[PDB]
Write a protein that binds this DNA or RNA. Structure first.
Ligand code: CA
Ligand code: CA
Ligand code: MG
Ligand code: MG
Ligand code: MG
Length: 350
DNA sequence: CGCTAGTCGACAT
DNA sequence: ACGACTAGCG
């Protein structure tokens, strides 16, 4: 999630209702709904007590989309991305920190802060995700567990034409090149749509409305695959690109100290880190539901060697990928928690 | 004055 | 895997 990205391109956003896509198909970043629903039962989840509320909290949104005549596809986060290892590690450590801070120092001190610390230590497991999957499937709703980050999977489904819109609360989806992104959607179906084509309607952006340039902006503003330089947020990220007359991004990143009149000594780790982040946004491994194959988000260009993109996701066998995608194989422990098969028992597969 | 990083409440009841 | 509010810096 990029800080201040909403306001920056506010002019490319319009308030809609889900009924706009009646008869059409939307894909959902379900982990957001899960994180939002687990809040109402953070205590039981922190203390390891059995709870089943988040499932209902997802199924009500599902029932709403279904009621307004939408075909939803629920996409789930899968294996942890190596390029995102640092950020995810940070989230892990913060989760453990809040978990301890509540569980021990608030069970005997003050109980009012206990729920607050518990809510800051919520960790969406694949088990819970599988509860939601079981429910949705029982109500006839297709599901898909991304090989890695659901961002890339959703972006793929939109760019491939399988879905026309994507429901999420994560603004990262734009940097991935999604056509339409529905944000901040409430219980009844009122949210903020963001069309990619409308990005040109933003004063502050300038000529940074193209996919590549917008991607660059998002990356060097600060993301989950690479932290920004100190003192550089969205505005200066945009200004650098606006003032850049040179097509090559590397030379620009090198002369970033000259463009902004700031004292910036750019390291090489930030250069190669930038290349890594770009390659992550471009070719992160997703799952093709039709062909049942693990593919890069975009087809590999001429200036990229696939053997060096280990951080963008590891290739596994197509059968293993298919089993992960069906939610049969647990992400954390790699065991067959289920044996669901789509061929037996107009779906995504076949 | 524009802008960035960092804190703390809402997130959903 | 959030965002309003703002103190402080260039
Ligand atoms: Ca409408
Ligand atoms: Ca895997
Ligand atoms: Mg993010
Ligand atoms: Mg995500
Ligand atoms: Mg993201």
């Amino acid at each position: 999630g990029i800080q201040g990205l909403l306001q920056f391109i506010k002019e490319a956003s319009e308030p809609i209702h889900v009924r706009k896509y009646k008869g059409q198909v939307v894909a959902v970043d379900t982990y957001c709904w899960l994180h939002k629903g687990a809040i109402a039962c953070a205590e039981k989840l922190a203390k390891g007590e059995p709870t089943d509320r988040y499932v209902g909290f997802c199924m009500k949104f599902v029932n709403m989309l279904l009621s307004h005549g939408i075909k939803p596809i629920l996409v789930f986060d899968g294996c942890t991305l190596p390029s995102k290892k640092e950020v995810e590690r940070s989230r892990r450590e913060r989760r453990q920190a809040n978990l301890l801070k509540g569980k021990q120092l608030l069970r005997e001190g003050k109980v009012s802060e206990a729920r607050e610390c518990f809510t800051r230590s919520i960790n969406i497991t694949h088990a819970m995700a599988h509860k939601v999957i079981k429910a949705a499937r029982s109500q006839g709703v297709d599901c898909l567990v991304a090989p890695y980050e659901a961002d890339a999977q959703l972006a793929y489904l939109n760019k491939a034409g399988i879905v026309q819109a994507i429901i999420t609360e994560d603004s990262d989806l734009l940097a991935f090149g999604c056509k339409k992104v529905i944000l901040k959607m409430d219980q009844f179906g009122n949210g903020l749509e963001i069309d990619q084509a409308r990005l040109g309607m933003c004063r502050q952006l300038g000529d940074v409305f193209t996919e590549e340039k917008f991607r660059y902006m998002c990356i060097l503003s600060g993301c989950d695959y690479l932290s920004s330089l100190r003192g550089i947020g969205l505005a200066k990220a945009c200004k650098v690109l606006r003032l850049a007359n040179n097509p090559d991004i590397v030379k620009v990143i090198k002369k970033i100290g000259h463009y902004l009149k700031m004292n910036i000594t750019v390291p090489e780790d930030y250069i190669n880190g930038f290349i890594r982040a770009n390659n992550t946004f471009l070719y992160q491994l997703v799952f093709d539901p039709i062909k049942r194959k693990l593919i890069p988000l975009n087809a590999y260009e001429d200036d990229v060697d696939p053997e060096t993109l280990s951080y963008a996701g590891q290739y596994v066998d197509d059968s293993i990928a298919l089993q992960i995608a069906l939610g049969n194989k647990d992400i954390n422990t790699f065991e067959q928690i289920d044996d669901y098969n789509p061929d037996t028992a107009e779906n995504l597969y076949f």
